[PDB]
Ligand binder design. Structure first.
Ligand SMILES: [Cl-]
Ligand SMILES: [Cl-]
Length: 162
């Protein structure tokens, strides 16, 4: 188990434009194309990303290429963030994967309202942070996923994924 398998379980794999759980256009392994209601807009973003006239459809290889880039950008976003970097550095590898999953799903922006949980996490108060994290829109909207991620932080093991 690793970050790639972990997120691939959480996001699934789709080769045609689809609406995520927030109603946004997405494709591949959770790659958000656009927050706009416009599908054409979404199709243009897709072509731009892939480098061709996709017609709203990509192959498995293109999906995987997007996913590599996105996981790479999530990490780097953490590291560049002044408030995140230190939490991230204080953690073991498993818990770091949990942090990358959340950044992947919600952006540096969404993860940033998790300040309190993060400070507990820094202090290694796992059970408490798990509880606080559950008090969120995030847990409310995608509970099964949220649960998997929270156990992961809580335990520091891959159990919720095995
Ligand atoms: Cl892109
Ligand atoms: Cl869910």
């Amino acid at each position: 188990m690793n970050i790639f398998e972990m997120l691939r379980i959480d996001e699934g794999l789709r080769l045609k434009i689809y609406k995520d759980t927030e109603g946004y256009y997405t494709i591949g392994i959770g790659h958000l194309l656009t927050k706009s209601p416009s599908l054409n807009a979404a199709k243009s973003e897709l072509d731009k990303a892939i480098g061709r006239n996709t017609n709203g459809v990509i192959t498995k290889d293109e999906a995987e290429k997007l996913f590599n880039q996105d996981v790479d950008a999530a990490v780097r976003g953490i590291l560049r963030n002044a408030k995140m970097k230190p939490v991230y550095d204080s953690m073991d590898a498993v818990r770091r994967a949990a942090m990358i999953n959340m950044v992947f799903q919600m952006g540096e922006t969404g993860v940033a309202g998790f300040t309190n949980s993060m400070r507990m996490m820094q202090q290694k108060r796992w059970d408490e942070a798990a509880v606080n994290m559950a008090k969120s829109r995030w847990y409310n909207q995608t509970p099964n996923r949220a649960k998997r991620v929270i156990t992961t932080f809580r335990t520091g093991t891959w159990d919720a994924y095995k």
